[PDB]
Structures are given as C-alpha cells and as structure tokens.
Design a protein around this ligand. Structure first.
Ligand SMILES: C[C@]12CCc3c(ccc4cc(O)ccc34)[C@@H]1CCC2=O
Ligand SMILES: C[C@]12CCc3c(ccc4cc(O)ccc34)[C@@H]1CCC2=O
Ligand SMILES: [Cl-]
Ligand SMILES: [Cl-]
Ligand SMILES: [Mg+2]
Ligand SMILES: [Mg+2]
Lengths: 129, 126
C-alpha cells in the first residue's frame, strides 16, 4: 500500500494491538519501517531501527502475561497518522494490573510505521484495591 | 515543566471549559507563539486572535458538549494525550465525533502545542 487512507490507518492500528495482545513480536516488528523510531514512554530516549525495536518488544512482551485491548476508536487523519486509546493488562508485584495508554503513529508511503510515540506514565497504572 | 498529575489537571480543565463554551478562558490557557493543529494534517493556526477565531467559530453557537471518554495519559516531560467525544449539530443532523488531542505544556503551564487527531471517519450520526 500506498500511504494509508484514514480507513487504512484505522485497520493498521487495530491490527497492531491484536499482535501485541496475541505477543507476536516478529509480526509487530514487520509492521514497522526498517528505520522506524519508538518513543515508549514518551519522554524516554527513542529506540531506532528494526533490531532495536524487536528487542524492545521482546523485553516488554517476551515474558508473556501481557493482553492489550482498545478502549475506544482509532482516530485517523489525512496525512497518514492515527491515535488510539488502549489498556494493557499484565503483572505488577505478582497481581494483575493495568496501564491505560495512547499511541500515536505516523506511517509511510509504503504503509509501514515510521514513528510511534506511546503516552503514559505511573498515573495510568492501576491495581485492585 | 508541569508534573504528570498536573497534566492530568490542565488537560481535564481544558475539556471542562470546551464543554461549557468559554472561549476567552480556553484562549488564556495557551502560550505565546502556541500552535494549534487541528485537525492534524491541516497547517497550524498561530496567533493569539486567530487561536480565538478558531474556538469562535467552533464553538460560539453555545451548542457544542465535550466530554472525556477515558483518562488523560501524561508523560513526565509536560505532555499528555486524551480521548474525548464532541457532540454537535451539523446542519440539522445530531452528530458525534471522536477525538484525541495531544498537548505539550511550557514551564509556565500554558499550551504550547495542541494536535487534534480526527476525521471524517470519526463522525457518527447519533
Ligand atoms: C511493557 C508493558 C506491557 C505492554 C505495553 C506497555 C506500555 C506501553 C505499550 C505500548 C504498546 O504499543 C504496546 C504495549 C505496551 C507496558 C509497560 C509495562 C508492561 O508490562
Ligand atoms: C469544531 C467542532 C466542534 C469542536 C471540536 C471539533 C473537533 C476537534 C476538537 C478538539 C478540541 O480540543 C475541541 C473542540 C473540537 C469539531 C469538528 C467540527 C465541529 O463542529
Ligand atoms: Cl474513546
Ligand atoms: Cl481510554
Ligand atoms: Mg486478541
Ligand atoms: Mg523508508
């Protein structure tokens, strides 16, 4: 594909969250441009290129015990970009938890993720109480 | 720069204000030389009077409601992003729209940039 249409951005970003959910790291990494960046969290130093991005998703996911679901619609532009609200479910201090996240993404004119920026800090982590 | 908890406060305070239609307090939350993109894909709007003409335009009828539809996500470098829904009338059709703003706050606590993510794919007749 060409540069994704708004409909195309909605479908690309929804598939990305299933991959994170199902932990299919190599498929995640194919969605990214070869020279992509990941800023996650946003505010931390960017991670360049597919080798560094695969290891990061291996770090983050490879241990298992992480479900990610959208909590609302993907918001898609007309310049290849979209934003999405989701929740991650995993393990913190041996007890389930949850991190509410928004990822923005900019795609390419080949339809691959050129950037990504994941918003969140500890204010968005919550636990049973 | 403002804290992650404080960003959850400035951004929520900004939807409060959209929701009741106070354009002058919305404009005061901004910086000098702020920019607005909105929608992200269109050139930026910059100037303080222009940023007012923009809120006057969208909002002015008194008939646009804004509410959050999830929590504000905030970073530790003075930035946040938020999901919300706008309801408005559009030439007699009752509609809705789904939106994500991303905002960065200067050290003075004012918006330095705002980028609003949405499209016509984010429109629904209610
Ligand atoms: C890595 C992680 C699980 C997945 C995840 C997190 C944060 C942001 C994310 C953004 C994504 O686009 C996909 C997955 C995550 C969590 C932070 C701590 C944790 O367990
Ligand atoms: C401008 C608008 C009402 C308000 C609004 C819209 C879109 C994005 C927004 C982002 C905001 O932070 C505050 C308000 C809006 C609508 C698009 C069409 C319309 O009538
Ligand atoms: Cl939402
Ligand atoms: Cl949400
Ligand atoms: Mg799944
Ligand atoms: Mg390229």
């Amino acid at each position: 594909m060409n540069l994704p249409t708004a409909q195309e951005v909605q479908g690309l970003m929804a598939r990305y969250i299933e991959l994170v959910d199902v932990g299919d790291i190599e498929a995640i990494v194919q969605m990214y441009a070869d020279d992509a960046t990941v800023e996650d969290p946003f505010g931390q130093p960017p991670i360049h290129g597919r080798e560094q991005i695969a290891a990061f998703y291996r770090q983050g996911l490879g241990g298992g015990k992480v479900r990610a679901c959208l909590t609302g619609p993907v918001r898609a532009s007309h310049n290849g970009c979209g934003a999405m609200p989701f929740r991650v479910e995993m393990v913190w201090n041996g007890q389930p938890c949850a991190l509410d996240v928004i990822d923005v993404m900019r795609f390419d004119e080949h339809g691959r993720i050129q950037t990504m920026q994941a918003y969140w800090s500890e204010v968005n982590l919550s636990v049973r109480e």
